[PDB]
Design a protein around this ligand. Sequence first.
Ligand SMILES: Cc1ncc(COP(=O)(O)O)c(C=O)c1O
Ligand SMILES: Cc1ncc(COP(=O)(O)O)c(C=O)c1O
Ligand SMILES: [Mg+2]
Ligand SMILES: [Mg+2]
Lengths: 280, 275
Amino acid sequence: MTNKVLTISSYVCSGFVGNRCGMIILDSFQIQSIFVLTTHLANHTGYPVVGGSGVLLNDFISIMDSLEVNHLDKDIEFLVTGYFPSSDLVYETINRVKRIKDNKKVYFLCDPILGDNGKMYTKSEVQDSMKELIKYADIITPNATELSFLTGLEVNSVSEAIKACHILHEQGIPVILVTSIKEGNDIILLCSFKDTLNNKNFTIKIPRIEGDFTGVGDTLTYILLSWIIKGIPLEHAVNRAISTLQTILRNTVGTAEINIINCIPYLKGTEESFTITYIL
Amino acid sequence: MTNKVLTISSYVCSGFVGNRCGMIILDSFQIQSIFVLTTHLANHTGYPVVGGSGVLLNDFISIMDSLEVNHLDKDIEFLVTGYFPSSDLVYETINRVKRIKDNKKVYFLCDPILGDNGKMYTKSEVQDSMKELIKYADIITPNATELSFLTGLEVNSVSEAIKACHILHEQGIPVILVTSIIILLCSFKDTLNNKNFTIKIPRIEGDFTGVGDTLTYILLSWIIKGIPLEHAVNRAISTLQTILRNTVGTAEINIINCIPYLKGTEESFTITYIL
Ligand SMILES: Cc1ncc(COP(=O)(O)O)c(C=O)c1O
Ligand SMILES: Cc1ncc(COP(=O)(O)O)c(C=O)c1O
Ligand SMILES: [Mg+2]
Ligand SMILES: [Mg+2]
């Protein structure tokens, strides 16, 4: 009956990226959520024309302030961030995260959206500001490209990914989920923990599917979050999420972008299709 | 496939009004839709503080242009409009509706969102602009407060609501659904091929925030799925009644919690044909 999640990410009028993926998934899981937008764009940035604007600092401040003063954030237990068009919004979000976490315990999943397949699709000022943002997170979900940028290491293998994670765990970050580390005809996901006394690092090997991956990572993020919110242990929540995503992609015609609307009946799938491999 | 609906209305970060209700409902009905925002507000206007801004004309034009140039609106069959914070967006929408309707067949439902219970909650410039907007709709869905404003007639009874619809029909408005008078009235200009009707709904006490928007999008969804209009209205009002009966005391209806009821097929009320 009250809002449990605050999610700060991008919005597109048509298509499924950022907070618009968030909306479909968290609504379908029936998780009450505040969606604060960082953009109001016609369509994602992969098109030749991208109408609309980033949200202005002063409007973002105004929004956050109104949520606070009207007590619409009083029961937030989860915070998620995603895409930012500008670093000022990132620094402001840091201020907001600090004030949230000073008051109460809130689990912050930072999806450090910067780029993919070795190419950034964010401003350089955002890239730099994201290095500061992640330090406040409870769990981060970079892809390999993101992880490389965040740490300054090459990430072309699981062993490199492990080294890279270690640098971020030393900064205080408790949990790092690395998506789409490369391996022959497959892709590896790595879940790495700062506290390896009480938690076990693991990998999942996923067969590579050819086709358009617009919105894939964002979908994974929100499906994972939703199962975390429901109380599914993290190993299981990861396996469910990547299992669901594989199911969605197997039911997408290859050239088409995944249609999250059409795949609503699959979102809450509980199949855990892959093997959890503990790394030694 | 492709986008079938374009919906232009307000957005709130927390709560369920305007295009945020739209998103939940159309997404649950699995109707592929473009949601162009006219605001980006923290919360609805009923709070003591309302953070955020209306969308700027130049950003609105940029978005519409980008939808067109990337072909993302080429297959739209349905258009809905709702809340606008300023009259410039209304006039620009009118330009976009004209260019849609000149060469494609698109069913435009205009929900002329101005006010309720005899009090407006929109700018007077938006009130004036809405008299122009409605002139391009295939169907409009005023409440009685809205219909009274749009015609300058008192609307305090069905018979007054009938008279008010007639003046708008004489001006070309083809279908008018008047949502609360409690009586709903569906009035047609062409009474040769369609039959005007009313539905009597028992009055429920409580908070109605997002009620009207919820009705609009459930009605549209059923129109889209090919249910005949009279039945689509019955389902929509039937579903809202069910949602309201399950809402406790002072709370606003929680569309997220009620997702399983949105696609309800019950037709709980009686369609009454009038003279
Ligand atoms: C606004 C926006 N554009 C684009 C993307 C990624 O899109 P693309 O890879 O198609 O450029 C995201 C997030 O993943 C986004 O939020
Ligand atoms: C932004 C916005 N605020 C408010 C409302 C209605 O608000 P109120 O709850 O003041 O009646 C609507 C639509 O009905 C809206 O779109
Ligand atoms: Mg990503
Ligand atoms: Mg209304």
